[PDB]
Amino acid sequence: TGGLPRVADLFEARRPKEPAILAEISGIVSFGKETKGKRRLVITPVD
Amino acid sequence: AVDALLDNGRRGRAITGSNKRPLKSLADMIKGKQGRFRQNLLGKRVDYSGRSVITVGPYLRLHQCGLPKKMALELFKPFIYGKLELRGLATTIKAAKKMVEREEAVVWDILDEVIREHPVLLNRAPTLHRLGIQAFEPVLIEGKAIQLHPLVCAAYNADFDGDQMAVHVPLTLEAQLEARALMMSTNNILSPANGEPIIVPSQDVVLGLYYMTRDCVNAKGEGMVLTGPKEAERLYRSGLASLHARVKVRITEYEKDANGELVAKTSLKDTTVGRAILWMIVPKGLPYSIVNQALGKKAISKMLNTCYRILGLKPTVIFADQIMYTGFAYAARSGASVGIDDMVIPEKKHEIISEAEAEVAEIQEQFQSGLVTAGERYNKVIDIWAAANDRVSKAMMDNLQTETVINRDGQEEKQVSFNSIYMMADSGARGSAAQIRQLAGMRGLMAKPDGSIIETPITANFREGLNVLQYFISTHGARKGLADTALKTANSGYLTRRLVDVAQDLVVTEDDCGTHEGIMMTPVIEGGDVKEPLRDRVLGRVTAEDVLKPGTADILVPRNTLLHEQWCDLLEENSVDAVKVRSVVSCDTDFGVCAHCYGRDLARGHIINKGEAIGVIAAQSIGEPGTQLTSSIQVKNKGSIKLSNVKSVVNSSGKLVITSRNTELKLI
Amino acid sequence: VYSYTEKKRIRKDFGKRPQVLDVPYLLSIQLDSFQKFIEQDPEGQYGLEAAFRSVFPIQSYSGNSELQYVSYRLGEPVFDVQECQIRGVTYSAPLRVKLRLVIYEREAPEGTVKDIKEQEVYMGEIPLMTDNGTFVINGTERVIVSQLHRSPGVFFDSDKGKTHSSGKVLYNARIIPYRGSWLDFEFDPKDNLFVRIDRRRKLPATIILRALNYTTEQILDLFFEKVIFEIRDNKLQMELVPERLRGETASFDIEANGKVYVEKGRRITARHIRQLEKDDVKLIEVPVEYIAGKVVAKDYIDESTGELICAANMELSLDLLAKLSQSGHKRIETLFTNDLDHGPYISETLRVDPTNDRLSALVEIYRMMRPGEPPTREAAESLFENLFFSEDRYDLSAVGRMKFNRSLLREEIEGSGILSKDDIIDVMKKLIDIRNGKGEVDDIDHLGNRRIRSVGEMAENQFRVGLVRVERAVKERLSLGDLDTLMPQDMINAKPISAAVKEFFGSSQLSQFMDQNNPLSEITHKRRISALGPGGLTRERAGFEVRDVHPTHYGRVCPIETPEGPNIGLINSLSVYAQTNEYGFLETPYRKVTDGVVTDEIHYLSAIEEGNYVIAQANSNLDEEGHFVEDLVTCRSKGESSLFSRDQVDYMDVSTQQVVSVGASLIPFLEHDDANRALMGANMQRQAVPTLRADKPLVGTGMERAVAVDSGVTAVAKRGGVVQYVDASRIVIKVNEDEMYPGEAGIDIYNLTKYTRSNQNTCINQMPCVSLGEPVERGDVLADGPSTDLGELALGQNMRVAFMPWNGYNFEDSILVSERVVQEDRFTTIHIQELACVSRDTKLGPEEITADIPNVGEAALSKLDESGIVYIGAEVTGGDILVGKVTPKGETQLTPEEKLLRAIFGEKASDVKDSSLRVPNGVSGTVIDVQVFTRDGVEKDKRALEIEEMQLKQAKKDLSEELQILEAGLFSRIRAVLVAGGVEAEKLDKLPRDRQLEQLAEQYDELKHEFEKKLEAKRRKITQGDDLAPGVLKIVKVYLAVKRRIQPGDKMAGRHGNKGVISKINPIEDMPYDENGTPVDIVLNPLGVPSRMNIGQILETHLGMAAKGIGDKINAMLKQQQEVAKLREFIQRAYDLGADVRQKVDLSTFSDEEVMRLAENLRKGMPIATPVFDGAKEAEIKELLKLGDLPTSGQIRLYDGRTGEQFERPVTVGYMYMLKLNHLVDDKMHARSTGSYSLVTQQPLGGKAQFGGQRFGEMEVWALEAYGAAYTLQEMLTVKSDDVNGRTKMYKNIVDGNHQMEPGMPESFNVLLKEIRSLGINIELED
Known about the structure:
It is classed as ribosome. This is part of a larger assembly, with 2 copies of chain A and 1 copy of chain C. Chain A has one helix at residues 4-12; strands at 28-30, 42-44. Chain A is built from 1 helix and 2 strands, in the order αββ. The radius of gyration of chain C is 41 Å and the shape is globular. Chains in contact: A-B, B-C. At the B-C interface, α2, β1, α3, β7 and α7 of B face α19, α27, α28, α31 and β55 of C.
């Protein structure tokens, strides 16, 4: 929201609806296994 | 049987012979709700207390309040009993009862003896934050309501409607010392959320000093010379010249050119009589330049802040009181009245409404043909009426800004219009040109029951007529306001509840530990303008590392240094933008915090000491604001375009296209 | 135009707007509803008679005792309003019902054995509504505050985007029953026609159809269109019905007659249907696509080829097509639904309801009732048919059935009560319309879902309960009634009704204690619109939308009347001109405008009919009759307030004020005031102080007398005539013969309440306004209620208010007032309080009042007479004793050295103690009246008997008046009989009053005989009327009297929403005065306005300068002792001031004598009737300051009473009408630190009553944790008032003055250690 509501959830640190995921490790990322419900986001490190 | 002692354990609620009664529960009897029935709202009606409404009291000095005789009796008896059998003006304590049984004038003098320098604690009921608790000195008042020092009520947010303050007697010398240690009136000057001297002249006192220091073109005596602001005092109290005449008076402004020795600098100033009188109140050290303005509310609060910076604590305190007494004094000299015949309405207002009429008529007709759609027509309408209000603004605002011209040393040299409205609108006290302009100009489009906007404005202003139509537009507004605050209140309390919940055990209990870490402090340069500076974040903190200057290999702020005003002015002499400060989340102190990781910004400006349980003071300070909670970008900042880490390239037409997502545009 | 009223004081009729609606009695809106309820109307009138009719003929199974209904009769009002207010007995009348109790022959074609009619049966009483919409039952007036719930009819709901939770805008329905249970409906973009029954879970719609035993081809026979597919000579065609083509797209090249009417790729919107119904082409060629995707109805199998592939209800598939379209069927009748318009709801709802017969249907509806248990089948058919079809259960009536069927646009908007099959299905058809094409949804704010429970309607609710509550013991009593046994008052008692009526009209959330302080405050309490109530829109369910404002409430819902805070949209009350519409709506007054001419026909409508009619606004420019100036006029079309040709308006609003309530009307220039300070204004007039000298607002709106006449605070006259004997508690009237009853002449009487108490324990006194020898009119006043002047609503008093900053006595809320106020004692109140006393037998021993009084001497008895009771006007203070109360002691406590001495020195030596009712701690007042109640059966001793004799004298004096006037009148007839029998006129002059004889000689005696039964019936009510209560035989309620004046610290305000508290009432010696010398009386703060925006009070300030200015003209002209013509020069100026508003001139009336009174009445200003929105103008205002010797500006340069200089730039000065609030400092200042604490808990005794210490809260605790106050917090929640012994260990400590204690234990803390001690852990602090 931008007031009490969102700040309250800030205190419970609620994982959102569509959580923006961050790249786990430095390195190349690729695909694998098309939509079966999920999809492989194979982030293979180079280092 | 053991279970019968707890409650009945988890058996079946053991009753007694022919009587439904789960037998006496020790568990619930020492504890209960909200912990126990002491540490809960159930903490009984305290002794040494007096619960009643409050009243003003101008003549009430800085370090004091006024207390009713009757409450005084009920709240000082034991002292009088011990004092009557101590001196020998009563034989026994029961004989003492009899003297006060008739209220003997004798015991009132003994009452005096136990009131003269007896610290008192004042705590209101609607108090959710610590700024509702202070300490004072008694003054015998023949009345029913507890009088209070005016320039403190703003912090209390305690008005005149039904605010009942409870008085709590600091009986032990410790509590009495705590009064005159941290809870004293002169001990709660800044807000424990930010270092500003929290009490800013609200409205009455502001206007007083506003009608004092002010300039114009026409004024009796404008031009003569005086060798002192003292005779300047005896010049206007008599009234042989006007309060805004530019008169040469020799004011002796001072300056702490030394480290405590304020070198004297006698200067001559062609100044207005009002601000000249303002100086007799101004403590030496402060520069005359700060009181050579047309008075501003932001300036008037930071004036005491700079009087706290330059002159320190003491000079600021005593000065604040002097202001209050003359605040009322010249407030009366103004006789700042406003009635129907004193207001002014532009007949250019109904002229802009004529314009505002034309356009909307034509747009609805475009819809009758079928050009603009309903929504298209919607916003179109809204925009022209908003711009119309700005024209109504550039109407009533310039009108009431400088339209008064007076014959003086030429044709008719204009001076800023002395309109009361103008004074409130420039003092900052209560004059909000937006409210005022919904009052004298077209109020505008009010929201709708949906949460959107009724495209119909409140054309007819408040001074002039209003219809039932305009009312119902604004009806959602009334509703809206009430609802939100009425509930934000409750949630803000549970907000502070969760805050105490989280930090109870944290105490600053060390000074230096062993960490050379903290986090990077950076100004929130985002969007257009640079909002929060590097300075105002670090203002009142402790430098983490040895920081270099934009100039290389030249350290300006050594590692452990307390950054205050001058050092912050030092930070802004060069162009250092990023500095690290030792953070408390990086604080190596085990189960506690060290001062070299916390800082100094508190309810004072000095070093945080060991003994300051900070967890809960954070709760209150942060939970307080609960009630106040709710295409093609052309660059407007004039600077150099610096492409940071972005890989752009020139192709046909010379367009510097972008091929990377990390396009961070900066304005070096 | 005038009455004797205007002769005493004419209010200057200032109005400019042509008015038409004669404001009715403002509580007739309650009276009339009550009138349609209880009234002799056996015709079938919707009320008591239709109510009883509904329940009658009352009988059960095989009892053979059908009870019929005849009529009823109501007794006499037991007491008068006055006695009901003084003693506190219910004001009602015995319901004497005439029940036709007819017993029938057992097992015969109903032959009568006894056709008895049992009359006047006592079925309890019914509170008669006093003609001011009031109800005095116990003590003072409690009133039935109207409520509001869901209007009985039918509902359609939205809940779009939030209750859909996907973006699929929902639009469903409901059916709000009148008397039974709900019937909800569904319709989501999920494609669902469901029905949530009664309240519980959602069931398929078809679950009802099959309970009625519905065959599939009876259900689909009514719902949709059947598409006739025809295969002629093995070619596929369809009989084109373009009417069905709504919601169908052009997939194949739509060919008809060979012509391509529809190219492939552009839906058949509303164009190609025109092109096909121009020649009605119902023969088209279709390939294969168009048919493969449908569902068939009849049973057509493969008749030429030979296979079982299709029977009933099947669609087409890719494999089997092979034999389907080559088989060749002649008439293929399918079903029809389309994915755009007609949603296949019911066609899929049968596919959700796994039933197909009555049995199964019954079962699943029972599961909606009680889930988990299996039903039977016979108790299942009983359940079903009796939930919505039993007339002894489900009812809707003409209210529910009108809004039901008119919302269905039918004509059967009156008739049945039970459900009709095709009507439930038509609402279902309308719901299909709602989720596909037509139909809209009813929002809660529109009257559509709002029913106004009225006073009489709420009575029918409580009384219907009474009917059935006792009936469960009446019905079976009819079965258990053989022949000569059951009779009225053998089945029906009084309690079964008493325990219900007294429970809802005595103390209920919709029938509460009327806040009594201001007559206006009283009307705004009696006449009120609550959104809360028994089954109303509460604050735990209704959120913010139910609270908001809706346009349709113009002229009915004043959003201004409501407390300030959370509850702000469920308290909003009615608009004055409005009246209750029969179905639960509101008759909205209008004016019939025959297009271009304003007729004076005022029409009452609703908000629903408002949507069909276009209405002009009252506040518009009309001319001469109603020939609208501009070509355009404000026309509220169908919700939109646009501009139209004036020749189209069907109606027009009554008056410009026709939108708000009383508290807003009486305050002018709201056309300049802010809505926020408008609500604040509303709030404070309802809290209008009961002042001593009640002055009426000079500049009102003309509803002053209107308050007096529409309220019941002033004793009005029901006949005109010369007053004969006016004292104070009595006003004896002689009535003029033109309206003097030919029934025992006609001498009326009006008894005035003299210095009594109220709910607020504030004083009420009807002050005699009529002197001796002054005639009245049928409709004038005799007394003055609290805060009234000559009947006229006089709340507070107006003073010379100013707006100048002046030494901090005006900081935003701080107010500064002249000491002259309390120096004249103009603003003072009287608080007469009642304190109950108990005596006469406590099981421990029969109690006696005072009798044996120890623990005192004779000093206390100086005011405790020969009864031990307090004097007839004492000055009791501090801790004295009001009345003596004795109570016995105890067995276990008597010592052996006093058991022996006990059985010697009398029967009661040391047993009876002194536990009297004492003067409340902390009060110093005066006992005025003693309300005593002798033991029911046995009298008191002497004092209570002295009070009876006291009452006796006060009553005797009055009844003798009405006696001697008729007794001596007919004596004059006897003075005419002796003349006829030989003149003895002068002989009777010399003879005593004892000297056609039969005739009047005997009538003299009867009037005296009447006089006897008069006072004895009166003393009947004096002697045995002291019934107290079972247990407490003798009750003594004392009446103290305490004047509380105006002092520094009291919260005072005004009308325009300007609050504040007097900071320091200063001596009149500091008051800034003008050139004249007359100081100012009020000094307020200016700074608020530019953000407060209540400028009307700065206009009222300048107009106030004028309203009083003219008064000072006549004031000084009367000092010159000038003639009637000089004052009339001024009257004419002040009548034709400076504009053309219709002043309604007189001068044919006595503009000499009739105005000579007005002279010394108008010398202190002039009462004006000014219209708020459409009344006074600035041109007229400045004209009156010019018409007075006042400054055109209204701003004089004053000279400080503490200086004497000119407050530079003339200051705002003039009069404004002040208004003190009921917030008093004696109800705020309660000091408690030391005293006594409770016994049940360590919590102190009291609160905001006796002993008011600070009930320290948990969050202030947290403030002390934000500070370093730890040691003080220690003693705070422990040693101070929490440790039962630690407090004394501190009291005996500071009587030495030593502030030094040790770390003591919270002792219960010591018991907490023993708690863990009896478990497993334990305390043994080591080292």
